[PDB]
Design a protein around this motif. Sequence first.
Motif, PDB file in Angstrom:
ATOM      1  N   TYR A  87     -10.675  -2.046   0.886  1.00 37.78           N
ATOM      2  CA  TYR A  87      -9.659  -1.145   1.415  1.00 37.78           C
ATOM      3  C   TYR A  87      -8.843  -1.829   2.509  1.00 37.78           C
ATOM      4  O   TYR A  87      -7.718  -1.426   2.802  1.00 37.78           O
ATOM      5  CB  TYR A  87     -10.307   0.127   1.963  1.00 37.78           C
ATOM      6  CG  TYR A  87      -9.312   1.147   2.467  1.00 37.78           C
ATOM      7  CD1 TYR A  87      -8.397   1.738   1.604  1.00 37.78           C
ATOM      8  CD2 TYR A  87      -9.285   1.518   3.806  1.00 37.78           C
ATOM      9  CE1 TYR A  87      -7.485   2.670   2.060  1.00 37.78           C
ATOM     10  CE2 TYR A  87      -8.376   2.451   4.269  1.00 37.78           C
ATOM     11  CZ  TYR A  87      -7.478   3.023   3.393  1.00 37.78           C
ATOM     12  OH  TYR A  87      -6.572   3.952   3.851  1.00 37.78           O
ATOM     13  N   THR A  91      -4.835  -2.483   1.802  1.00 33.86           N
ATOM     14  CA  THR A  91      -3.874  -1.960   2.765  1.00 33.86           C
ATOM     15  C   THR A  91      -2.934  -3.065   3.237  1.00 33.86           C
ATOM     16  O   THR A  91      -1.739  -2.839   3.424  1.00 33.86           O
ATOM     17  CB  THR A  91      -4.601  -1.345   3.962  1.00 33.86           C
ATOM     18  OG1 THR A  91      -5.698  -2.150   4.351  1.00 33.86           O
ATOM     19  CG2 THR A  91      -5.127   0.048   3.690  1.00 33.86           C
ATOM     20  N   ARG A  94      -0.737  -4.334   0.190  1.00 33.88           N
ATOM     21  CA  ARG A  94       0.262  -3.309  -0.091  1.00 33.88           C
ATOM     22  C   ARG A  94       1.452  -3.442   0.851  1.00 33.88           C
ATOM     23  O   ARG A  94       2.602  -3.275   0.444  1.00 33.88           O
ATOM     24  CB  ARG A  94      -0.356  -1.915   0.041  1.00 33.88           C
ATOM     25  CG  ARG A  94       0.565  -0.796  -0.418  1.00 33.88           C
ATOM     26  CD  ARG A  94       0.100   0.555   0.097  1.00 33.88           C
ATOM     27  NE  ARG A  94       0.616   1.657  -0.711  1.00 33.88           N
ATOM     28  CZ  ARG A  94       1.878   2.077  -0.673  1.00 33.88           C
ATOM     29  NH1 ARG A  94       2.755   1.490   0.133  1.00 33.88           N
ATOM     30  NH2 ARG A  94       2.265   3.086  -1.442  1.00 33.88           N
ATOM     31  N   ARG A  95       1.169  -3.747   2.113  1.00 34.12           N
ATOM     32  CA  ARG A  95       2.215  -3.908   3.114  1.00 34.12           C
ATOM     33  C   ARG A  95       3.117  -5.091   2.774  1.00 34.12           C
ATOM     34  O   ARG A  95       4.285  -5.124   3.159  1.00 34.12           O
ATOM     35  CB  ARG A  95       1.597  -4.106   4.501  1.00 34.12           C
ATOM     36  CG  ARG A  95       1.125  -2.812   5.147  1.00 34.12           C
ATOM     37  CD  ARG A  95       2.064  -2.365   6.255  1.00 34.12           C
ATOM     38  NE  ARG A  95       1.970  -3.222   7.434  1.00 34.12           N
ATOM     39  CZ  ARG A  95       2.864  -3.229   8.420  1.00 34.12           C
ATOM     40  NH1 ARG A  95       3.920  -2.427   8.373  1.00 34.12           N
ATOM     41  NH2 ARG A  95       2.701  -4.040   9.456  1.00 34.12           N
TER      42      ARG A  95
END
Length: 154
Positions: A87, A91, A94-95
């Motif tokens: 996770y 995260t 994804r950024r």
Amino acid sequence: KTQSDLQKFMTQLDHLIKDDISNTQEIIKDVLEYLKKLDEIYGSLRNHSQLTEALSLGKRLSKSLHEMCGIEPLEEEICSGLIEQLYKLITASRRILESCADSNSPYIHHLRNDYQDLLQEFQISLKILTEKCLENPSSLQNLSLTLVSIIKTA
């Protein structure tokens, strides 16, 4: 702080299992080994090259994870750290994809490919988790709690 967490999680496997099971020593072995790989990524991220490998691990790492619960005793601690570590990469990665925005280029395609697999595989771990946890939520509170954490709607 992320890199340190990855390392601390490695010793956690060899230790957590050493006290629980043994045959899984091979499984957790691949996990820790991955933590070290993902370790260099976190620090070598934003380079538009290392992040790609970060997605691959999340996917392939999921396979080793699925084997943890798909055979022999299962570890909530390891299953928790793995979901958390992933996770953290999901995260960050994804950024990166959003950093470039839509636009039009083949580079984004490669990321969306390795990213779609990292996300889907990540969903797999949660899927089987809710099933095994749905039976005994109280027992597997660590997993459930961690599941509700990684998931948000803000």
